[PDB]
Design a protein around this nucleic acid. Structure first.
Ligand code: NA
Ligand SMILES: [Zn+2]
Ligand SMILES: [Zn+2]
Ligand SMILES: [Zn+2]
Length: 83
DNA sequence: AGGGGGTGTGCC
DNA sequence: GGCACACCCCCT
């Protein structure tokens, strides 16, 4: 599975990863946020899922040193480092 | 400090 | 296919 966009030639082992990679060339953002008044659109479905947590307020990653909770694991990891 | 999007990569 | 981690780079 090779990318035939201009002088690229990037290879992938799965179809889904190449199809998502081609979106970085065509600029297509198929995953729209349906929240009222938002308007954000993303090229990968996981970006929209992560973005929805800002609307829903879901904070699954909880710090065990204090009481702060975060919606993303990297935000919790950085919070633990600079604790 | 907290809070976002972009991107690559490995797993289900 | 999506999910999620990890990291980057940005803004607040
Ligand atoms: Na495939
Ligand atoms: Zn390409
Ligand atoms: Zn939104
Ligand atoms: Zn803490």
């Amino acid at each position: 599975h090779t990318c035939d966009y201009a002088g690229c030639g990037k290879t992938y082992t799965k179809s889904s990863h190449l199809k998502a990679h081609l979106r970085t060339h065509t600029g297509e953002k198929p995953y729209h946020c349906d929240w009222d008044g938002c308007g954000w659109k993303f090229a990968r479905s996981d970006e929209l899922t992560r973005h929805y947590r800002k609307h829903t307020g879901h904070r699954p990653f909880q710090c065990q040193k204090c009481d702060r909770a975060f919606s993303r694991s990297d935000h919790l990891a950085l919070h633990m480092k600079r604790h």
